[PDB]
Design a protein around this ligand. Structure first.
Ligand SMILES: O=c1ccn([C@@H]2O[C@H](COP(=O)(O)O)[C@@H](O)[C@H]2O)c(=O)[nH]1
Length: 193
Protein backbone atom coordinates (compact mmCIF):
# COMPACT_ATOMS: atom_id res chain seq x y z
CA UNK A 1 0.00 0.00 0.00
CA UNK A 2 1.14 3.61 -0.38
CA UNK A 3 1.68 6.27 2.28
CA UNK A 4 1.23 9.89 1.22
CA UNK A 5 4.14 12.17 2.13
CA UNK A 6 2.54 15.58 1.58
CA UNK A 7 -0.61 17.48 0.56
CA UNK A 8 -1.51 19.85 -2.25
CA UNK A 9 -4.26 22.20 -1.04
CA UNK A 10 -5.75 23.32 -4.35
CA UNK A 11 -7.79 26.51 -4.71
CA UNK A 12 -9.43 27.57 -7.96
CA UNK A 13 -10.32 30.94 -9.53
CA UNK A 14 -14.05 30.58 -10.44
CA UNK A 15 -14.13 33.08 -13.33
CA UNK A 16 -11.26 31.37 -15.17
CA UNK A 17 -12.51 27.85 -14.48
CA UNK A 18 -15.94 28.83 -15.78
CA UNK A 19 -14.56 30.48 -18.93
CA UNK A 20 -13.18 27.11 -20.05
CA UNK A 21 -16.70 25.68 -19.96
CA UNK A 22 -17.99 27.52 -23.03
CA UNK A 23 -20.80 24.95 -23.26
CA UNK A 24 -23.64 25.75 -20.87
CA UNK A 25 -24.29 27.66 -17.65
CA UNK A 26 -21.78 28.21 -14.84
CA UNK A 27 -23.10 28.84 -11.27
CA UNK A 28 -19.85 30.24 -9.89
CA UNK A 29 -19.11 32.64 -12.77
CA UNK A 30 -19.76 35.67 -10.58
CA UNK A 31 -17.51 34.59 -7.72
CA UNK A 32 -14.49 36.89 -7.30
CA UNK A 33 -12.62 34.93 -4.63
CA UNK A 34 -10.58 31.73 -4.67
CA UNK A 35 -12.60 28.68 -3.68
CA UNK A 36 -11.54 25.17 -2.69
CA UNK A 37 -11.02 22.61 -5.43
CA UNK A 38 -9.71 19.92 -3.11
CA UNK A 39 -7.03 18.55 -0.80
CA UNK A 40 -4.82 16.12 -2.72
CA UNK A 41 -2.50 13.66 -0.94
CA UNK A 42 0.86 13.42 -2.73
CA UNK A 43 3.46 10.66 -2.99
CA UNK A 44 6.95 11.15 -4.41
CA UNK A 45 5.83 14.07 -6.58
CA UNK A 46 2.55 12.56 -7.73
CA UNK A 47 -1.08 12.84 -6.64
CA UNK A 48 -2.32 9.63 -4.99
CA UNK A 49 -5.79 8.81 -6.30
CA UNK A 50 -8.65 6.34 -5.96
CA UNK A 51 -7.48 4.56 -2.83
CA UNK A 52 -9.49 1.66 -1.25
CA UNK A 53 -11.38 3.83 1.23
CA UNK A 54 -14.80 4.49 2.73
CA UNK A 55 -17.80 5.61 0.66
CA UNK A 56 -18.53 9.34 0.83
CA UNK A 57 -21.13 10.06 3.54
CA UNK A 58 -22.68 13.54 3.52
CA UNK A 59 -23.93 13.09 7.09
CA UNK A 60 -20.32 12.88 8.30
CA UNK A 61 -19.78 16.54 7.40
CA UNK A 62 -23.33 17.87 7.86
CA UNK A 63 -21.95 20.28 10.47
CA UNK A 64 -19.58 21.82 7.89
CA UNK A 65 -22.09 22.14 5.04
CA UNK A 66 -22.53 25.75 6.07
CA UNK A 67 -18.87 26.65 5.50
CA UNK A 68 -18.57 24.27 2.55
CA UNK A 69 -21.40 25.86 0.57
CA UNK A 70 -19.52 29.15 0.76
CA UNK A 71 -15.87 28.10 0.49
CA UNK A 72 -16.23 24.88 -1.51
CA UNK A 73 -19.02 25.42 -4.05
CA UNK A 74 -19.25 23.44 -7.26
CA UNK A 75 -18.58 26.33 -9.66
CA UNK A 76 -19.39 24.32 -12.79
CA UNK A 77 -22.71 22.78 -11.77
CA UNK A 78 -25.37 23.45 -9.13
CA UNK A 79 -24.56 20.30 -7.13
CA UNK A 80 -22.03 20.88 -4.37
CA UNK A 81 -22.40 17.44 -2.77
CA UNK A 82 -21.47 15.73 -6.05
CA UNK A 83 -18.24 17.75 -6.12
CA UNK A 84 -17.35 17.02 -2.49
CA UNK A 85 -18.15 13.33 -3.01
CA UNK A 86 -15.86 13.18 -6.04
CA UNK A 87 -12.96 14.90 -4.29
CA UNK A 88 -13.28 12.59 -1.30
CA UNK A 89 -13.41 9.41 -3.38
CA UNK A 90 -10.62 10.42 -5.72
CA UNK A 91 -8.32 12.20 -3.26
CA UNK A 92 -9.47 12.05 0.37
CA UNK A 93 -9.49 8.26 0.51
CA UNK A 94 -5.74 8.40 -0.07
CA UNK A 95 -5.02 10.03 3.30
CA UNK A 96 -7.84 8.34 5.23
CA UNK A 97 -5.33 6.29 7.24
CA UNK A 98 -4.76 9.50 9.21
CA UNK A 99 -7.72 11.74 8.37
CA UNK A 100 -11.28 10.42 8.24
CA UNK A 101 -13.78 12.24 6.02
CA UNK A 102 -14.85 14.70 8.73
CA UNK A 103 -11.23 15.53 9.54
CA UNK A 104 -10.26 15.95 5.88
CA UNK A 105 -13.02 18.43 4.99
CA UNK A 106 -12.41 20.34 8.23
CA UNK A 107 -8.74 20.48 7.31
CA UNK A 108 -9.59 21.97 3.89
CA UNK A 109 -11.90 24.58 5.43
CA UNK A 110 -9.24 25.58 7.96
CA UNK A 111 -6.56 25.80 5.28
CA UNK A 112 -8.82 28.02 3.18
CA UNK A 113 -9.46 30.33 6.13
CA UNK A 114 -5.69 30.53 6.68
CA UNK A 115 -4.80 31.12 3.03
CA UNK A 116 -6.68 34.14 1.62
CA UNK A 117 -5.07 34.65 -1.77
CA UNK A 118 -7.03 37.73 -2.90
CA UNK A 119 -6.49 39.37 0.47
CA UNK A 120 -2.77 38.63 0.22
CA UNK A 121 -2.43 40.19 -3.24
CA UNK A 122 -4.55 43.31 -2.70
CA UNK A 123 -1.90 45.28 -0.78
CA UNK A 124 0.21 44.97 -3.93
CA UNK A 125 -2.67 45.56 -6.35
CA UNK A 126 -1.60 42.22 -7.82
CA UNK A 127 -5.13 40.86 -7.83
CA UNK A 128 -7.15 39.81 -10.91
CA UNK A 129 -7.77 42.47 -13.54
CA UNK A 130 -7.61 40.40 -16.71
CA UNK A 131 -4.09 41.57 -17.53
CA UNK A 132 -0.68 39.89 -17.67
CA UNK A 133 1.01 38.93 -14.40
CA UNK A 134 4.46 37.55 -13.60
CA UNK A 135 4.70 34.03 -12.15
CA UNK A 136 7.75 35.09 -10.15
CA UNK A 137 5.99 38.17 -8.80
CA UNK A 138 2.82 36.36 -7.70
CA UNK A 139 4.75 33.48 -6.11
CA UNK A 140 6.88 36.11 -4.39
CA UNK A 141 3.95 38.00 -2.86
CA UNK A 142 2.35 34.80 -1.59
CA UNK A 143 5.60 33.50 -0.12
CA UNK A 144 6.17 36.84 1.64
CA UNK A 145 2.72 36.57 3.21
CA UNK A 146 2.50 32.85 3.99
CA UNK A 147 6.16 31.91 4.29
CA UNK A 148 6.48 29.35 1.49
CA UNK A 149 6.20 29.28 -2.31
CA UNK A 150 2.81 28.28 -3.75
CA UNK A 151 2.27 26.32 -6.95
CA UNK A 152 0.59 28.21 -9.79
CA UNK A 153 -1.55 26.31 -12.32
CA UNK A 154 -2.63 27.66 -15.70
CA UNK A 155 -4.78 26.53 -18.61
CA UNK A 156 -4.29 27.53 -22.23
CA UNK A 157 -7.12 28.55 -24.52
CA UNK A 158 -6.90 26.13 -27.50
CA UNK A 159 -7.94 28.90 -29.90
CA UNK A 160 -5.91 31.92 -28.81
CA UNK A 161 -3.06 30.10 -27.04
CA UNK A 162 -3.32 32.60 -24.19
CA UNK A 163 -2.42 31.22 -20.76
CA UNK A 164 -4.73 31.93 -17.79
CA UNK A 165 -4.19 31.33 -14.08
CA UNK A 166 -6.82 28.87 -12.87
CA UNK A 167 -5.51 27.38 -9.63
CA UNK A 168 -3.13 28.21 -6.79
CA UNK A 169 -1.65 25.44 -4.68
CA UNK A 170 -0.51 25.61 -1.07
CA UNK A 171 1.78 22.68 -0.18
CA UNK A 172 1.75 21.02 3.24
CA UNK A 173 3.81 18.32 4.93
CA UNK A 174 2.40 14.91 5.85
CA UNK A 175 0.98 16.39 9.08
CA UNK A 176 -1.46 18.51 7.09
CA UNK A 177 -0.44 21.55 9.13
CA UNK A 178 3.14 22.51 8.26
CA UNK A 179 3.29 24.67 5.14
CA UNK A 180 6.16 23.73 2.82
CA UNK A 181 7.38 24.97 -0.55
CA UNK A 182 5.54 23.89 -3.67
CA UNK A 183 7.93 23.20 -6.55
CA UNK A 184 5.77 22.49 -9.57
CA UNK A 185 3.88 25.07 -11.63
CA UNK A 186 2.05 24.43 -14.88
CA UNK A 187 2.05 28.19 -15.54
CA UNK A 188 4.68 29.76 -17.76
CA UNK A 189 6.63 32.88 -16.73
CA UNK A 190 3.65 35.08 -17.57
CA UNK A 191 -0.10 34.60 -17.63
CA UNK A 192 -3.43 36.35 -17.47
CA UNK A 193 -5.07 37.03 -14.11
O1 LIG B 1 -15.92 23.63 -9.27
C1 LIG B 1 -15.58 22.60 -9.81
C2 LIG B 1 -14.28 22.27 -10.33
C3 LIG B 1 -14.05 21.08 -10.91
N1 LIG B 1 -15.05 20.11 -11.04
C4 LIG B 1 -14.82 18.79 -11.68
O2 LIG B 1 -13.88 17.97 -11.00
C5 LIG B 1 -12.92 17.38 -11.93
C6 LIG B 1 -11.57 18.01 -11.58
O3 LIG B 1 -11.04 17.64 -10.29
P1 LIG B 1 -10.01 16.40 -10.09
O4 LIG B 1 -10.61 15.13 -10.54
O5 LIG B 1 -8.70 16.45 -10.83
O6 LIG B 1 -9.91 16.32 -8.45
C7 LIG B 1 -13.50 17.57 -13.33
O7 LIG B 1 -14.24 16.44 -13.87
C8 LIG B 1 -14.39 18.81 -13.14
O8 LIG B 1 -15.50 18.87 -14.06
C9 LIG B 1 -16.35 20.35 -10.55
O9 LIG B 1 -17.23 19.50 -10.67
N2 LIG B 1 -16.54 21.58 -9.97
Amino acid sequence: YVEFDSFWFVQQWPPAVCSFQKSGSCPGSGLRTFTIHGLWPQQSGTSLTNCPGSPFDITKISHLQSQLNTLWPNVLRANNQQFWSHEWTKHGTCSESTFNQAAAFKLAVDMRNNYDIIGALRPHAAGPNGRTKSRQAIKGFLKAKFGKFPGLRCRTDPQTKVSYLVEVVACFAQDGSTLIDCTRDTCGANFIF
